[PDB]
Amino acid sequence: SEKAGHQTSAESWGTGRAVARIPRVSGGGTHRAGQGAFGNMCRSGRMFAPTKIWRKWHVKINQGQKRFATASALAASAVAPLLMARGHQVSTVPEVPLVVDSAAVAGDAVAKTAAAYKLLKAIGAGPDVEKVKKSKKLRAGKGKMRGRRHRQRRGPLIVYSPEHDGKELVKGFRNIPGVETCPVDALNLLQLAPGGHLGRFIVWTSAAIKQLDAVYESKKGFFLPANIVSQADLSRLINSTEIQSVLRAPKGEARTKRAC
């Protein structure tokens, strides 16, 4: 509050008194009388640089960079080792970019929550769901006092099509802990790279794949970026015949004997 620390009447006693040159509350019939005020070092005083609402809480990010990050997160989710590195239990699941049939995802047959859980168990997300469920526990700190009581791991992300799958699969889901849903036409980076770490486990649908291609074609002012390297396998790049054939003879070994 802008009035904090300033709702008092204090004046410095002077210079020649053997007391600190600090504003002191006038009066004379209470504990508060004669005490320092108006200072950052004084009890019941103002804080240094009081916080203001105009702090620039939001960050403006180029939409091209946002789309670049989303594309990179999608590629990382396609990569299999990155899921394990991010902490997803993907070992009983085949075809890391899972595609589950839209005819099996659309309608009441997934709008029922038990059916959604059964589908996840059948496709192999069961380990991840159980991991989240067992990982729930209490938060350390004041977040419990501030409404953030518990925290848990993050499970599979379900990308679907509102116009083909029909948006009721969210209600079929939306109660299984850790499991999240998202439409293909609007993908979220907070969901794709939770905590800034790449490689989230994602289950797709066939219509989701079609419309993923469609939406990345439909983005305006953005094209899929071209990498600065073409082959990312430095082992093949170096141990290729061309490099080794034009290469000079080795000048030593990895561990060299010391002479003197």
Partner: protein, 134 residues
């Protein structure tokens, strides 16, 4: 997860409401479950506790012990069960404060009002069961 904007997930407000609730809200809060026999007899899970009910204490230091409710002391959210008491230093017996969520109702004090309450709960449950079934 909450959806309606009217309800709040505020711990502060929830605890304030619980600890400053009036007597009727306290009665609704101190609702207690019914036994299995009463469950398949009335199609009712829980009902607010009252003075004439016979209950079975199934939680706490008193393991599995039965008795008639003596007093529903709404002020500190406890009920008094007959013969469940502890002796003070002087040897005078004082009732032990037990919680309706820790007790289970075995025999139910019956009147027109509670028959109506049971009928309403049963009607809602059977309507929703029929709607889900067909």
């Amino acid at each position: 997860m909450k959806v309606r904007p009217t309800v709040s997930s505020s711990r502060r407000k929830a605890r304030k409401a619980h600890f400053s609730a009036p007597s009727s809200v306290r009665r609704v809060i101190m609702s207690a479950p019914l036994s299995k026999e009463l469950r398949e007899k009335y199609n009712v899970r829980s009902i607010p506790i009252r003075k004439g009910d016979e209950v079975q204490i199934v939680r706490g230091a008193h393991k599995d012990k039965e008795g008639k409710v003596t007093s529903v002391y709404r002020l500190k959210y406890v009920i008094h069960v007959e013969r469940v008491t502890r002796e003070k230093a002087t040897g005078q017996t004082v009732p032990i404060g037990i919680h309706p969520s820790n007790v289970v109702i075995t025999k139910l004090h019956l009147d027109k009002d509670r028959e109506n309450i049971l009928a309403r709960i049963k009607a809602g449950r059977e309507q929703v069961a029929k709607a889900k079934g067909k």
